[PDB]
Structures are given as structure tokens and as C-alpha cells.
């Protein structure tokens, strides 16, 4: 009896009637047998929506919004709101200057997104993305928490969605939140949004330009376990694009300390980041040196063991540091002065894989540029193992070209051969025939270091004679006319010495 009567009073033509009928319907929604009666009525639900949608009074809105909000606390009531076309209307209400009305709408949508199938497609037609982002400037931290969590549900697995947020200026709005407020539940969800965006390749640079790197570094030592982990996955994703930002001297300090932790997911994420920000930046390379970065890193590899997802990033981080800058010398000396040479040569041997072995040969080349390391590296027994790897690669995977393993290995022996002791060892391994064969490579790089190592060994009578006996005179003459001043200068030297 009741329902059929209220439905009619909900839309006459004279408003006071509709404005006064809304107030009545609103109170019935707080009772159980009333809601059940209201839901199963395909007309009551419809009239309610068009009223909240077309009204012009405040409280009529304040009351109609509350009526739908209560209907959303249960499955049956959601399916009804859905059929009556209530979502397009709900979005419209997201522009009200009334707090109560704004704060309901958003929560009803939140519920629809979480348990009704189809909501996602719909909320996107109504255009709920530009609106939710426009609300990010309010000041109610609890309000924000609900809003940002709505952005994360819609942006997951959808690029069209990440691009609109981006196009509406989401990146330098969220970052602001992170360096202004302290509510934990807000800072957690806002990072969950930033994370999802860091995946694509267009949405990345917008974050680093705002200052997302410095704003995310702030919460690395907070009591929240989940906030510190989401912050870390995210800094690792941006890393390969922040290699030129000034004033990163602050964040680099913290990162180093974070190598010493009980959490091994915190060590792994911290490893890669230091590895990436260390690329081609003389200002970042030095700073890490001043805060004891070398000593800390050597220690990281020691406890890592055979876990190749920790060792790999770290080794690449020592490789960058021992090259191109004012402290590159100090760097090379320190790795030794901190008992690291032993473990470095151990990673060359199996269990290891190609990607890892590649980076260690590169670290070793740099380390040999310091005289004080000639004798040590030999005693650990690197030469005999370096040669062994050269062979198996020559003939032949995992993501590594075998020609790279050959160009690196040769250049390693090239620099070591600066000390007489090493030369006597290298030569006494029937290596010459192979070195001579590399002269025939179509790769100029391999030609320089091949003719280079020969230039070194040839400074000794016996050695020179054995080289000429293989027949290097033939290829060496052709390499004289190379336009590569390196491959040339070296071909003239070997011939001079063996004559």
C-alpha cells in the first residue's frame, strides 16, 4: 500500500510535494523490512534517481543521496541501482559545494565499483576520471583516501584510463599529497596509485619532473611495512629515467644505509636503484663514495650467496663507480682495501649464469687499471678461469650474444698483461694460436684488443718468435691500413717488435 503511494508523490509537478516526499522515503530506508520492500520495486528506485538528478533544492539532494547510499550495503540493492541508471547521476553529484552530498556520492560509487559487474565500464562513460582528479585538492584526508582508492580500481589493466589521469595532471597532484600530509592510510593508497602508473612508458617522466623521487624518499624509514615496500617497488620502476635529476644527494644517503636491513626484499630493491642512478652521473658517483658506498656494497654480495637477483645489480653498481670521474682511482683501491677481490673471482665459476658472468668480467677490467691490483687478482686465480671462458664462447643464448663474452674476456687479459708475471702465465697456456685467430674478426672492437694483447706479449724475444711462427704477419699487414687509429697503431707495434 505505502510504496505505491510514495512513488506517485515523488514526481507530481509541484515540488514541495516531491521535496517533502523525499524526506519520508529517506527515513524508511533505515528500517529492514522497509528497504527490502523498497528494493523489489522497479519504480520506486527509478523515481528516486531522477529526483536527486533534476532537483534544485539542497536538502532534497542531501536526502535522496542518503537513500541510495543505504541501498548499496547489499547485493540486491546494488543490482537495482544499476538497472535504474543511477551511476551517470551519481557522478553528476560529484560537483556539489555541499559536503554531506559530496561525501555520500563518492562512497556509493566506491561500493558499486567493488561488487557490481558492469560498474567499471559505466563509470567510464559518465566520465568519472576527470572529476575524481579535480577533487584531489580538497583538505579532508579521509575524503581523499576514498577517492584515490577509486582511481586505482579503474586504472588497473587499462591504458586508456592511465592516459586520461595523466592528461588531467594527476602526477604532480598526488606527489604533493606525499610531501604534505601524514595520515598513513592516505599515504598508502596514494602510493598504490603511483605504482600502477609507473609501469607504462609514457606515464613515467611526468612523475620524475614533479619531484616524485624526493617526495617518495621521505617515507623510507616509517613504521609502516606496506608503505615502505610500495615505495621501494615504485622507485625501482622510475629509476631508469631519473639518471639526470639534480639534488639527488639527499636520497642517495638513505639508500646506502638501507643496504643493512633484516628484510631481504628491502635489500634487493635498494640494490637495483643504486645501480641505475649511478649511470653516467659524476655528481652521484662521488657522493656515494663519500658516504662509504664501496664498503657497504662489497658486504652485500658476501651475504647474498648464490641468490642471483641481489648479486647482479650490486656488481653492476661497483662497475659504474670504478670508472670516469675524479674518485675513480680511490674506488678501485677501496674494493681491495675492503677484502672484496676474493668473492669477485668466485662468481665467474658455475652455478652462475650468462647475464651475471658478463657483468663480472666488466668489473674485473676496470679493477686492473690500478697497479696495486695486478698481483692480487693473479693469486686468486683469475687468468686461468678467464681464458677458459674465452674458449667455450668462441665456438657457440640466455639473452647474451657469445661475441660479447669474447670481446670482454680479451680486453681483460689485455690490461693484466702489463705485469711481467702475468705474461709468463698467459703465454704458457697455448693461447697465442687463438689470439691470432681473432685478427680475422669482422668486429673492429675485437681487433684492437686482440692486436693489443699481442703487442704486450711480443716485447719478449721467445714470445715474438712464437707469434710470427703462427703466421700473424699476413693479417697484421692488412690491419695497418685500417682507418681505426686504434686497430692500426697496434698493428704497427707488433710488427716492429717481432723484427
Amino acid at each position: 500500500r505505502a510504496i505505491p503511494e510514495l512513488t506517485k508523490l515523488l514526481n507530481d509537478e509541484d515540488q514541495v510535494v516531491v521535496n517533502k516526499a523525499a524526506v519520508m522515503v529517506h527515513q524508511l530506508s533505515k528500517k529492514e523490512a522497509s528497504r527490502h520492500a523498497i528494493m523489489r520495486s522497479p519504480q520506486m528506485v527509478s523515481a528516486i534517481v531522477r529526483t536527486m538528478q533534476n532537483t534544485n533544492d539542497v536538502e532534497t539532494a542531501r536526502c535522496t543521496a542518503g537513500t541510495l547510499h543505504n541501498l548499496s550495503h547489499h547485493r540486491e540493492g546494488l543490482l537495482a541501482i544499476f538497472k535504474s541508471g543511477g551511476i551517470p547521476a551519481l557522478v553528476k553529484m560529484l560537483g556539489s559545494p555541499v559536503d554531506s552530498v559530496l561525501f555520500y556520492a563518492i562512497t556509493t560509487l566506491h561500493n558499486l565499483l567493488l561488487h557490481q559487474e558492469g560498474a567499471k565500464m559505466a563509470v567510464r562513460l559518465a566520465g568519472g576520471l576527470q572529476k575524481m582528479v579535480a577533487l584531489l585538492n580538497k583538505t579532508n584526508v579521509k575524503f581523499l583516501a576514498i577517492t584515490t582508492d577509486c582511481l586505482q580500481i579503474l586504472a588497473y589493466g587499462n591504458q586508456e584510463s592511465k592516459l586520461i589521469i595523466l592528461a588531467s595532471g594527476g602526477p604532480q597532484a598526488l606527489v604533493n599529497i606525499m610531501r604534505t600530509y601524514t595520515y598513513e592510510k592516505l599515504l598508502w593508497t596514494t602510493s598504490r596509485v603511483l605504482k600502477v602508473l609507473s609501469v607504462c612508458s609514457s606515464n613515467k617522466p611526468a612523475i620524475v619532473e614533479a619531484g616524485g623521487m624526493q617526495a617518495l624518499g621521505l617515507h623510507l624509514t616509517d613504521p609502516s611495512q606496506r608503505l615502505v615496500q610500495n615505495c621501494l617497488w615504485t622507485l625501482r620502476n622510475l629509476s631508469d629515467a631519473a639518471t639526470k635529476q639534480e639534488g639527488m644527494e639527499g636520497l642517495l644517503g638513505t639508500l646506502v644505509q638501507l643496504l643493512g636491513s633484516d628484510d631481504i626484499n628491502v635489500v634487493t630493491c635498494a640494490a637495483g636503484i643504486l645501480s641505475n642512478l649511478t649511470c653516467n652521473n659524476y655528481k652521484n658517483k662521488m657522493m656515494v663514495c663519500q658516504v662509504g658506498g664501496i664498503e657497504a656494497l662489497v658486504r652485500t654480495v658476501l651475504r647474498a650467496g648464490d641468490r642471483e637477483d641481489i648479486t647482479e645489480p650490486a656488481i653492476c653498481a661497483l662497475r659504474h663507480l670504478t670508472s670516469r670521474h675524479q674518485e675513480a682511482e680511490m674506488a678501485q683501491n677501496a674494493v681491495r682495501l675492503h677484502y672484496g677481490l676474493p668473492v669477485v673471482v668466485k662468481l665467474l665459476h658455475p652455478p652462475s649464469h650468462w647475464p651475471l658472468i658478463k657483468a663480472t668480467v666488466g668489473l674485473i677490467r676496470n679493477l686492473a687499471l690500478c697497479p696495486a691490483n695486478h698481483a692480487p687478482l693473479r693469486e686468486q686465480g683469475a687468468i686461468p678461469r678467464l681464458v677458459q671462458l674465452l674458449v667455450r664462447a668462441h665456438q657457440d643464448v640466455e639473452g647474451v650474444r657469445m661475441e660479447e663474452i669474447v670481446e670482454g674476456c680479451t680486453g681483460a687479459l689485455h690490461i693484466l698483461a702489463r705485469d711481467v708475471h702475468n705474461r709468463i702465465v698467459i703465454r704458457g697456456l697455448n693461447t697465442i694460436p687463438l689470439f691470432v685467430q681473432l685478427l680475422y674478426s669482422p668486429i673492429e672492437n675485437i681487433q684492437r684488443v686482440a692486436a693489443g694483447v699481442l703487442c704486450e706479449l711480443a716485447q719478449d724475444k721467445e714470445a715474438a718468435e712464437a707469434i710470427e711462427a703462427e703466421g700473424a704477419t699476413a693479417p697484421l699487414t692488412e690491419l695497418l691500413h685500417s682507418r681505426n687509429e686504434g686497430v692500426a697503431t697496434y698493428a704497427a707495434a707488433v710488427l716492429f717488435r717481432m723484427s
Binding site: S198, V199, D240, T243, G272, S275, N276, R324
Partner: peptide, 11 residues
């Protein structure tokens, strides 16, 4: 020389 690694694509 020093070359980066896009961790977004590895995980």
C-alpha cells in the same frame, strides 16, 4: 657506456 635496466619489464 654505463647502461640502465628497465625493471618495469622484468617484473
Amino acid at each position: 657506456l654505463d647502461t640502465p635496466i628497465n625493471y618495469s619489464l622484468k617484473y
